[PDB]
Each structure stands twice: as structure tokens, then as C-alpha cells.
Amino acid sequence: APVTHIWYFKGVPSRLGYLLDLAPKDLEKIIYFAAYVITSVDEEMRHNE
Amino acid sequence: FFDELRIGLATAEDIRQWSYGEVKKPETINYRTLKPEKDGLFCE
Amino acid sequence: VSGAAAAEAALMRALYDEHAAVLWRYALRLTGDAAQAEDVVQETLLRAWQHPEVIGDTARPARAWLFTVARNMIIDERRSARFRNVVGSTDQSGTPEQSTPDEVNAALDRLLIADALAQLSAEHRAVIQRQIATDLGIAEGTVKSRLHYAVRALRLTLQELGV
Amino acid sequence: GSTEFLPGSLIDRAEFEAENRRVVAEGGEPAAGRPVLMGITKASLATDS
Amino acid sequence: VDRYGEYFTGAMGAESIQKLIENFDIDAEAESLRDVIRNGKGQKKLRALKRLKVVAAFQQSGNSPMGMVLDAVPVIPPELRPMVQLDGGRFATSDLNDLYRRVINRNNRLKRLIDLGAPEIIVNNEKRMLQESVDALFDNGRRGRPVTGPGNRPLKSLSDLLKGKQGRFRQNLLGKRVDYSGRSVIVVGPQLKLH
DNA sequence: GCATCCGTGAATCGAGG
DNA sequence: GTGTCAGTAGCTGTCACGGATGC
RNA sequence: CUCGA
Question: Which ranges carry the RNA polymerase sigma-70 region domain (chain C) (predicted)?
Fold first, then answer.
């Protein structure tokens, strides 16, 4: 299972957080299975339904 | 004599290209024969 | 239907939230290492999911069964696999250092051996620096001999120097 | 301007003038400058090596 | 997921961030940041400047941000994590061996769980432990509480091999120990010449 | 938009147990 | 194979400083 | 750990 390199997550400033515009705390919840995250959403199908 | 020293992110492919094999088993050695267990952290 | 395959999970996640955070503390006190406790907890609960004959009787204490499962696994780790190794750590301030000798002798020996090689003939040389009879294109008795006489010239030179 | 210098970054006043030398002669806009004082620690971490 | 699962896709853990990096247009976000930079309030401009400093790196250098998520971890050669024997018949081992060993254990358990179809809760709560263990291997203690060894002693990580006075850089590179050298007490020798 | 809190740093060599 | 309560030690007696982190 | 400039 893929895993994140702590240096780029927790190291300040959170490099991943800067790359994805994701807050460090949100990213922490994501990586350590505290919250789900939406990868993709078919907005057109949703509009049509 | 070598001019530059480059550093960058290691691709998964680079990590696999370095390794001479995967460490499957978690064993270290045998505490009687002092021989390293196969596919362990000391696999010969 | 599919609701049942989901009911399996919804049944496990309901014992987690009530027994995992407590089982952890037990293995913690018994091992003094939260990491191994984290491991043992998952091992235990996996077995639990594998032994449904225990949670089915909801009205009975399940935690009580879990504690014994864990308590047994910990000592299984205190088995022969622990007695020999668990002692020290290299980076722990209290262990020596793998020290390698100073190559003085070996180097002086080879420096002499190299000085009693200029005192040779190129053929004795090519033979000593190597069954060889297959390459150099000579007999095996020629080998045996050239080896013999060459080694004796070498011993002669060496003892001439006072070895 | 026409340089690849990330605005807000602190760059040695030699490379700045050399790069604006090439760009001024190239037709593009030379990067703007403003003298900046750095403490010894921060300048030491900013070395090219 | 039970209601509107056909319209979106969601995930958890580190694999999800891997996916996010995959579905990410580096150049586009870089240009969005530059547009914010050309004309913006300092309050909301410093944040964008510092973000560009990161994104433009991946943009120019031609290395993918996917590198920040690992599919395989390297194992340091054995002589740099040596295992020595004690004069009492027992053994002492480098801390890296304990860390690598814990990581290997959790990884093989993840393989088992994936094969056995364990409940999703166990698989995810195991992936989290693998994450924490690789975090410890690389920079133990960086996040939260360190991995205690025997005696509630924090174990040394790979990144602990380099920091400070005892790190490789300052201890074994900027200053070595040298052959052909000695030391002793000093005494004044008045009859000596200056040279 | 601003206070909190995180992470960084903190002399050199040397002896013995 | 496992099945009645069955649940850390230790510890805050450092500090100045900058800046991302967070309400 | 204890110690010397």
C-alpha cells in the first residue's frame, strides 16, 4: 500500500500541503485514516441527474 | 575528479533499480548457526 | 444480498470502538512497548474476526476472551526468538565498535612477497599468479614442477632476507 | 520581468545583474531589484551549495 | 457512497494523496499562482509566493511530485546497521534493524489481510500503522510520540544519523580522527628556541 | 487578519568505569 | 488452544526566536 | 556516569 515520506508531510512547511493547497491538519487526517477525501466527481452526470 | 553532486527525489523505479532483491521475510539471523536467514534483513 | 456482506464490517467496527483501545493497554503494560502492542492488537482482532463462535453470543464477555488471546501471543514472542537478541543495541551508549585491525602486517608481508617476485622468471611468475595447465598450454607435471621449484626459489629468497 | 527568477526570492546581486544583462540585450524586460539585508544564519543557509 | 456513489470517487490514506498528485496539473496551478502574484494583496500574496516556490520546482526540474509517495522503501546495507555480539553470549543490534523489522512485520501483515479479505476497518487501521512505521524508519519522533525502545528510550532513525554534533556531517566529515598523532601534558621549556 | 505553537538552535578536546 | 473483574509510566524544574499553523 | 584544561 502506498505510503507518504514524512519529511515532505510533517516537515514545516508541509511540502504536500503547499503542492495540493491542503491544510497540514487536513492532510494529517487524510494520511492517518481519520477522514476520507474526494479524488474525483463526475460533475456533468450529477448535473444531468 | 568529478564536477557536480546532484540530488533529487527517488522514483519507485530508482528504488527498485538500486535494490539487489526484496526483503520478504522479517527474520534477521539464526542465533545458533550465526548464518543470515534467506530473504531476511541479511540475505546473502 | 449485499447488506449482509456489509453487516460483517458493521459488526467488526462495533467491537473495535469498544474493545481495541482497551486491549491495547493490556498488552502495553505487559510489554512496555506501544509499538508491539499496536501489532498484537491487530493480530488478536484479526483472529477474532476469524473465530466468530465467540462474538455471536453477544450476552457473554468477549473482552475476557480477547485478553487471554493477547497474553498468550506476547509470551510466544518471549520465546526462544527473544532470549538471544533482545539485549542491547549498537547505537546504545554501552556497546563496543566493530573495529578492524591496522593492515600493517599483511601489507609488509605482501611487500616482501613482491620483492621476491622480481627475483623470478616470467614463466614461474605467470604460473604462480594462477588446473592452470589448461591455459598456459603445458603439462600438469610441468605445473607441479614449476610450482615446486618456484616455491623453493621463493623460500630461498625469503630466508635469504632473514624471514 | 522576463527572468525565471521567482518573485520574492533572494538572489545574489551578481547573477541578478548577469541575467538582466542577457535579457536587456534579448529585448525582454529585466527583472526588478531591491537591496535586501540578510542575517548571517539565513545567508549561510542560502548558499548555492 | 450508499446513495450517490455512481457520481463521485473517494478514498483514504496515502493512496488517496497519490491519486490527488496524479490528477494534478502542475503547469496550470503554477500559472494560477503567478496570476495571483502579479496583482494581489500581500496578506494573500505571501502564501501564493511560497506555494509557487514549491510548485515551480516540480514544474521546471522535470521530476514528478509522485516521488513524495513511496511504493517501495530502500534497505540500507547491513554493515551500516551492524549486529555485534556481546562477551556474555548475547547479542546487540543497531536500532535501524528494529525499525526495519517492525515495518517488515506490518507490511507482511498487510499482505495477509489483503489476501484474506479482512474487514475494511482492519485493512485501513493496518495501513495507518504501516504509515506510522515508515515515518519512524525515516525520522522517528518527527510526528507525535517517538517509538520507545527498551527503557522508554527513543530509537535512532536514519535522519538521526545526520543531525547535530553526532551526525555524520559534523562528526565524521567536517572532522575525522587521524593516524600519526599523539597527545600529552605540556611543560615549559625555557631553554627552547621559538621554533 | 493575528495569536498560538511548532521547530530550530545552544564550545573544543581529553581519561576511566 | 485461548474465553466471569481482568486496562502505561512518566512527567514541565530550559529558553530565545522566527514563521507556518490554526481560530 | 565522574572528572581535567
Answer: 15-82, 116-155
Instruction: Give the distance between the most distant pair of CA atoms in chain C.
Output: 96
* 3-state SS assignment for residue D49: coil
Instruction: Go through E90-119 and write b for each residue having 16 or more CB atoms within 10 A of its CB, e for each that does not.
Output: ebbbbbbbbbbbbbbbbbebbeebeeeebb
Test mutation, D6, D9, D45, chain E, max E CBs within 10 A: D6
Contact assignment for C90 to E83 by CB distance below 8 Å: yes
Q: Give the list of residues 6+ apart from residue E29 with CB closer than 8 angstroms, or none.
A: E55
Q: CB of A20 under 7 A from strand G?
A: no
* Nucleic strand G contact set for C 20-59 (CB, < 7 Å): 21-22, 25-26, 28-29, 34, 47, 51, 53-54, 57
- The Cβ-side half-sphere exposure at E15, using a 13 Å CA radius, reads 10
Q: Whole-angstrom Cα distance, residue E162 to residue E77?
A: 17
Cα-trace Rg, chain E: 26
D45 interfaces chain E, CB cutoff of 8 Å: no
> Any chain E CB within 8 A of the CB of C99?
no
- CB within 8 Å: B26 and E104: yes
Cα distance between residue A1 and residue E112, in whole Å: 12
Contact residues for B22 (Cβ-Cβ < 8 A; gap 6+): B39
- DSSP β-ladder status, E91-93 and C88-89: parallel
In contact, C125 and C136? CB cutoff 8 Å? no
CA R_g for chain B = 16
Say whether E138 and A6 touch across the interface (CB within 8 A): yes
- Percent helix, strand and coil across chain E, each to the nearest 5: 50, 5, 40
Header resolution in angstroms: 3.8
The conformation of residue A1, written as its DSSP 8-state character, comes to -
Q: How was this structure determined?
A: X-ray
- Tell me if chain E has a CB within 8 Å of the CB of C64: no
Residue E180 has what DSSP assignment? S
Q: Does B28 touch chain C (CB under 8 A)?
A: yes
Q: What is the DSSP letter of E11?
A: E
What is the chain B residue with the closest CA to C81? B31
Nine-digit cell string for C162: 632473514
DSSP bridge pairs for E70: A3
C-alpha cell at E57: 520546482
| Maximal CA-CA distance, chain E | 99
Asked if strand G comes closer than 7 Å to C163 Cβ, the answer is no
Neighbouring-strand partners of residue E187: none
* Sign (positive or negative) of CA dihedral B21, B22, B25, B28: positive
- Euclidean distance between the first and the last CA atom of chain D, given in angstroms as a whole number: 26
Rounded Cα distance, A37 and E90, in Å = 49
Collect contacts of C131-139 with beta carbons under 8 A, ≥24 apart. Answer: none
Residue type, C55: I
